[model samples]
Target chain A: LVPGSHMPPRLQRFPATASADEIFAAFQEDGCVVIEGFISPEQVARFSQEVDPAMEKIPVEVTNNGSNDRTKRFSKCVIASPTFRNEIIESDLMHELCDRVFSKPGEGMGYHFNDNMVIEVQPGAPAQRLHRDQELYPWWNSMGPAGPECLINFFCAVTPFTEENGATRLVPGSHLWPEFTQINERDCPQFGKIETVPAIMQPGDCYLMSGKVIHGAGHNATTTDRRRALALSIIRRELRPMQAFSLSVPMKLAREMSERSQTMFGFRSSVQHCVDMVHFWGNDGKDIAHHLGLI
Target chain B: GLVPRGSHMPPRLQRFTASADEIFAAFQEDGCVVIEGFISPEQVARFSQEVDPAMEKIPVEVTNNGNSNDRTKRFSKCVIASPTFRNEIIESDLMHELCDRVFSKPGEGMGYHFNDNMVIEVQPGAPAQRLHRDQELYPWWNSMGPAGPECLINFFCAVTPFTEENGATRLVPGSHLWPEFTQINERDCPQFGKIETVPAMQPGDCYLMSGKVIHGAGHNTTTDRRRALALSIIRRELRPMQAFSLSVPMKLAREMSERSQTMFGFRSSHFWGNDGKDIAHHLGLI
Candidate 1:
C-alpha cells in the first residue's frame, strides 16, 4: 500500500440501532467503525445552541490554549456547557460502547473517561499531521505486535464530513502495527508509509477509534464550508486521564453529580487498590473515611 | 513605632458586624487582626466534632519539621482531615470572595485560590515560639516591599477558643508595613514592645493574618488546650501548602468547585504547574 494511494476500503458503518454486542464485535474486528445517527439531527440542533456561542470566541485558525492551529477547538463540554449534558456526554451510544470496549476481551473493565473536545477546522485549513492519541502515556507502545488497546475514542461530527471539508483521516489497520512501538516525537517525517483513509460521515454520525490507530484531521479543500467535530475518548480505568477532570470541575459540581457521571469523571477508585481518588487526597488516603470514628 | 505591646490597640475585626470592606481595610492597615466569627460557633463545633477524634489520636508534635517547637503539635493536609476545612473554608463562597478581596489584581479574574490548612495544637505548658513571618521564606518575596502580589493570607480558624493562657499568637499591629525583616533571632527584635496578643477567641472566630504580619505563638499555661486550623490562601503565582489537586482523592476532588482545583494549581498560571510540558493536554495541570 502506497501513501495516499487507493482510498482504503470504506470504514465499517453501522446503524444507530446496532446492539451493544453487535457494535462491540464489529469494533473489535475493524479497529475502527462509524455508527450513524449517534447524535440525531434533532439533538444536533439543540446541542448547537450552547456550542456555537462558546465556539464564537474561538477565532479562525486559533484556539484558547493553542493546541490546534489551523483548527478552532474548545473542550470540557461537560464543564463548559450544561445544555447538551444528557444527549452528548451521557449519550446511550457512548455509555454502552465505553463499557463494552474497555471490558477485557471475554472478561472485565469499565473504561476511564479520557476527554470531550470540540474541534473545528476553518475553510482553508490544511490537513493535520498524523499521530497516535495514546502517545501521551510514556509506555503506550512498549509491548510488541499484540496487546490491549490503551484507548477507545469516539469522534462525532457536528457538521457533515466531506472530502471538500476537513474530515478525519486514519489508517485502516494501524492499531495492529508494532514497528513504531518504540517511536517517539523525536523521530518524525523520515518514518513513512501508511494506508490512509478519509471518513465520510453525515452530520450527527459518529466514528469510534482505537488510540493506537494512526490518524489526523484532513485539510479542508472547500472555499466556504467549515468542518466541525466532537470527540469523546475513553481509556483503561487504571491509567491517568488526558483531560484530568479531577482538577477542572469543582467539588460542588461533583457533589451534585449522578454516581455514573461522578465515576466517569474519575471519582471512582483505581482498579488495583480500589482506593477512591478523593480518599487518597488526605494523609492516609482515607479522608472520606465515612468522616470517621478513630480516636 | 507599632501599636502598644498588648492585645488592645487594634481591636479584633469582628465578623458579621464588621464590613467586608472594613475587614479588608483593617487587613491593609494593621496586617494582623482577628476576624471573630468567620464561621459560627455551631460551625466551629461542627468542625470539632468532625476532627477531634482523629486529631486526638496523634501524639503531640509528631511531624515537626524542626521549625515549629514541640509545643506546636501540627496536623497537615487538613482539606481531607476535617469536613469543616472543606465545606466552610475551602469550598464556601465567602472564603473565595475574601481571597479575591485580598489577593486579586487587575485581570486575575477567578484566578486567586486556596493553598491548604494545618491544625496547630498549642498545648498546655508549651513555650513561646521563635518569631517568624511567612512571606520572608520565599526567595523573591523578602526582596520586595508590602505591595508585592505574591501575598499569602491565612485564616487561622479557632477549632477551640484562643486565649492568652492558651497561647494565641503574639501579633504586632501594623508590623507588616515595616520595610525590613522584623527580627534577628527568637527572643529579640529591633522593636520589642510592639508585639501584641488578643489571646481570647471564640469557637467560630479565626485570627485572619497576612503572612506579611510579624507573628508567633506564645506559651500556653492554661489547663485547657489551644487548637486552631490555619487555613491558608496564596496568590496564583505561588504553590500551595497542600497540593490538593494531586493529594486529594478523586471522589473528593470531584466534589470540589472548579475554582477550588484552579486554586490547587490545576488550572495554573501560565507555567507554574504545567512545567513547560503538554502532558495534561493543552488544557491544564496534571
Candidate 2:
C-alpha cells in the first residue's frame, strides 16, 4: 500500500515499487526512507574539489548573508562547471535513472545550480529551518494531493555527510502527510515517533528523495572541518528553470559545449530556446507569440 | 518644406518612406529622434496613474544598488506585474504599427522586447546614464557588411514633462553611423566623443533611437518630479521572443488574432510537443 495510491500516476513515482496500500501503510508507520548510496565516493570528491574554487570566486558580499560560518555558504552554477556538467548532462547513469523514475525520456530537462553554496560549517551554526523547496515557486502548489512541479530532489554529497556535521534530516514516508508545513523546534515530536533519520553518506553518495518528504539540515557541532554537498537537481526535462539563461557568454562558447551541457543550459529544447530568445536583446514578446500562433 | 502656422517645422516632418531606409538614415544622422506625440497625453496619464500603485509595491532592496554613483537604475516589477503597462506596451495596436513600420514581414526584423515600464523619478542628484552603445549586447561581427541595418531601437516616452532640470536625456549626435565607435569599451568612451543634451518635452512626446547610439539621462537639478515610459522595439526577424507560452498562455493566446500571436512569437500549429507542453506545465496552465 503506497501512501499516495489515490494520487495521479505521475505523482506515484516516489516509492516506485510500493503499492498505494503499502505506501500509505509505510507513511502511517515511518516518516521517510533512505535510498542508500545512489552516487559513489569518487564522484563526491571530484564535485567537492571542483566546487571549492567556484565558491571562492563568487564575490563574498554576494554569497555572504552576514553569516560567519564558512560551511553555510551557498554557491550557484554547479551545472556550468565541467565536472558537474559531465555528471548532469553526459552521464548515462543519470539519464537511465531519471527515465526509470520519471516515466519519460531525459531530453528536455532543466537544471539549475544554487546561487548560495553552503560549505565548511563552523561550530554552533544554527540548524536549517525545515521547508519544502517546491513551495518557493507558485507553480508547485498544484502537485495535487501529492506535489507537482518538482518530482524529486537529487542530493549529491560532495563531502562525507555525517550526523555531527549536519547531514540532512528527513522523515521517512512523510510525503503522505501534506499537513506538516513547518517543523517547530520547541514542540517537535519525539525522534522515534517522528522518524527523523540522518542521511549520512560518503562524498559521492547521491540521495534521491520525494519532494514531499520533510527534510532539513541539522546543526554542525563537529570540531573538525565540515565540507559541502552539491545538490544537482533534475526535474522533468519539460519544465523551465526560473532564471533566464545569460547571453553574456559568447554563442561560440555555447555552440562548443557538449550536448548534455547545452541541454542543461537550455539549448536542446525548442521551448527553452524560444524562452531564452525572449530574454535576449531585440525580441518583441507580442510578435514572437504571433509567430508561434501561425505554426 | 514650409512649416504650417503655429507648427514647428510642420511640412519638414518626415513621413511615408521605406521603413529600413528612414530608420537607418535617422540612426546615422541624429543618433536619436523623437517620434513626436506617439502616445497622447491622455494615454500617458492613464498609464502612469494605473502603474503608480504597482510601482509602490516593489521591494526596495531589489533597487538598492551598491554603486550609488552609477545611473543605471532598474525597475523590474513595473515591467512584469502591471496589466495596463503590459497591454499598452505589448498588446496595443499603436505599438505593433510602430514595429511594422521599422521591420518587414514574417516579422524577422525585431529581436527582444524588454518591458522596463518604469517611472524614473530622478532625484536632483541622480547622475546621467552611462554613455554606451546597444550593439555591445550582440557580436562585433554583426556590425559588418549588410547586417548593420539598425538591429535595435530603444524608444522612450515622457509620461510627465522631461525638463532639463528634471533629468532630460543626453546623446552623442551621429554616433550610430560612426562604425569606429562600435565595440569600444565604456572606459574608453570619454576619449572618442562628448555628450549633448536632448530637448525637454511635454507628456506626449516620444524618443526613438538606434541601439548603436551613446546616450544617457541627465541628472535632475530641480525639485519637480520627472517620470518617463520606455519600451524598446527592434527588428522581429532578427531575434525571437522569450517564454512565448508562459508570457502568452495557450488558452488566451490561441484566441488572439493572427497578427497578435505573430507579434507575440506564436507560430502556427506545428505542435512543438513537449517543449511547448513543458512550458505550459511549468506555468501550471496545462
Candidate 3:
C-alpha cells in the first residue's frame, strides 16, 4: 500500500478568523493546512507594492538541470518590506501559533525567526520534486522518529495560488511516515507516486506546512500571470537557523522593532537549561542585545 | 603600532589548585590562560594509549596536509574513541568547577554543552593555522563585541609535551577585547608579530582560551609529532549547529552520565523535548 493513502482526499482548510487552536489542530493532524485570507487584501497589496522595487532586481534563477528556470527567489523580504515584518513576523496570530506549537508549556523558550523570502514562479515552471524541508539537515532523519517539529513555514500567497499557477503541492499526514535513511527523486519513486493535493489559495491566504511534510511547488501553466508568494520560516530556539537573521536583518531596521520582535530574530538568548542552571548562547548568560547595546 | 616581536608578552599559567578568581582575572585580562598540570601524567598516558589505536587506523590520505606527506592528523568523536578521555578528562572534577566559574553569570544560572572533541597530531614541518576566533562560526557573535557573552570555551590539553620547538598553540594576548578584526590575514595588523606568544607545556597541561580570542595551532619545526586534544564547550542553544549529539548511538548514549547526556542535548529542555518529554526520556535512556 502507498504511504498515507488512507488520509482525507483534500488538505484541510481554516477561515481567516480561525483560532490558533483550530489551525494548529489541523496542522498537527495533517502536517499541512491552509488559512484562507491570512492577510487582508489591503495589507497584501501594500506588501506587494513595498517589495516590488527590491524584487525586480533579483534575476530569475535556474536550478535542477533547468527544471526550475521560471522561478525567481529573493530571501531578504523581511528587509525589503516593513509590512512583512510587522504583519507576519510579529503578528498576534504568529505569536500564538509559534508559542502554542514550538514552546514547551509555561516555560517561554520561544521560537527563532529562521528566514523570510519571496518566491515568484513565472509561467512554464513545472511541478517541483517532492521533498522534506528538514532535508537541509540530512542527519536529522537518522535521529529516529520525527521528534517535535523543529521547523515550520508559512507560504503566504502574495498573488492568488491556483492549480494553474504554482500553488504548493502538499502530501497530508506524510510527517508520520517512517524514517528513511537515504532518499532521492530516483530512489524514492513511491513519493512521487503518492497522492498530492495542490494548496489552492487566494491572495493573502497562507499555506502552512511542517518541515517534515512532503511538499513541493506545483506547476505554473498560466500564460501570463506569475505566482508570487512570501515564505516566513521559524524554528525551535534550541536549533540554529539556516539563515542568520541577526546579520540579514539590518540593525537600523531591527532597532525599530519591538523587543519581542528583536528577540524573535535572536537579539535575546533563549533559556534552555533546567531551572537554576546556566543559560547558553548569550553574552555571559545575558541578553545579546544588551551586549550589542541594542536594548 | 610598530613595536618589535620582543615586546610581545605570553599568556600566564596558573596552578590547577589556584582559586577561580585569579584564573578568571587572568582570562579577562588576557584572552587565554594555561592551567599547569590540569590532568595527571598517569591519566594522560592512559587516554593517549586508548586513542593512538584509533588515530593509527585512519586512512593516511585523511591526514595529509599537502604541505607535508602526512603532517597533520585529526580525529573527532573523542568520547567514542576513548572512554578514558571521557571519564578522566571530560568528566574531570576540576575542569567542571573551572567551567562553572567561567561560564556562569550571577543571578542567572547558565549551563554549557560539548561543542567539538578532536585529537590533533601535527608532525614536524607542518605549517601553523591562521589566527581566528571560534565565534566566527556563528556570525551573530560578531555584533556582540568583546563585552558579549562568553559563548564558547576550549581546553587544549597537551597529549605530549608542548615545547617551543614543537608546535604549541599560539595566542594573541588580550585580542579578544580588541575591536573585531575585519581580516584574518594578521600580516598587516600591527599586533600580529609584536603580540603573539606560544607557551611551553607538559603532558598534563591544558591551555584554556575564550572563543572570542585570536589563536591557532602553531607550526611544528621539531623532529617529533606534536599532539594536542581540543575539547570545546559552548552555550546550550548552539548545540544544533554541530551534529555531535545526533551522531551518538542510543547504545552508547545510555552508557554516558546524566550530566554528560544533558550536555549533549539528550536531556529535554523547553526547546529540545519531544511530546513534552526530554529526548533521553523520550528514547527511554533516562
C-alpha-based local distance difference test score of model 2: 0.48
* C-alpha lDDT of residue B266 in model 3: 58
Docking class of 1: incorrect
Q: Is candidate 2 or candidate 3 better by DockQ?
A: 3
**Local error of candidate 3 at B279, Å?**
33
- Interface RMSD, candidates in the order listed: 14.1, 17.1, 17.6
Candidates 1 and 3, the one with greater lDDT: 3
lDDT, candidates in the order shown: 0.64, 0.48, 0.70
The model with the greatest TM-score is: 3
Chain B alone, TM-score, model 3: 0.84
Could you give candidate 1's per-residue lDDT for residues A51-128 as a string of tens digits?
A: 888788766744454254667767657666665565566677677887776654432335656667788888878777
lDDT of 2 by residue, A66-177 (tens): 2333444543444335555445435555454544444322224333221113354555455666655554332343332344334455665667778887888776556666
Q: On residues A95-126, what C-alpha lDDT tens digit does candidate 3 reach at each position?
A: 78888877765546657766676889988788
lDDT (10s digit) by residue, model 2, range B143-197:
3422245555666778768776777776555666554554333465445443443
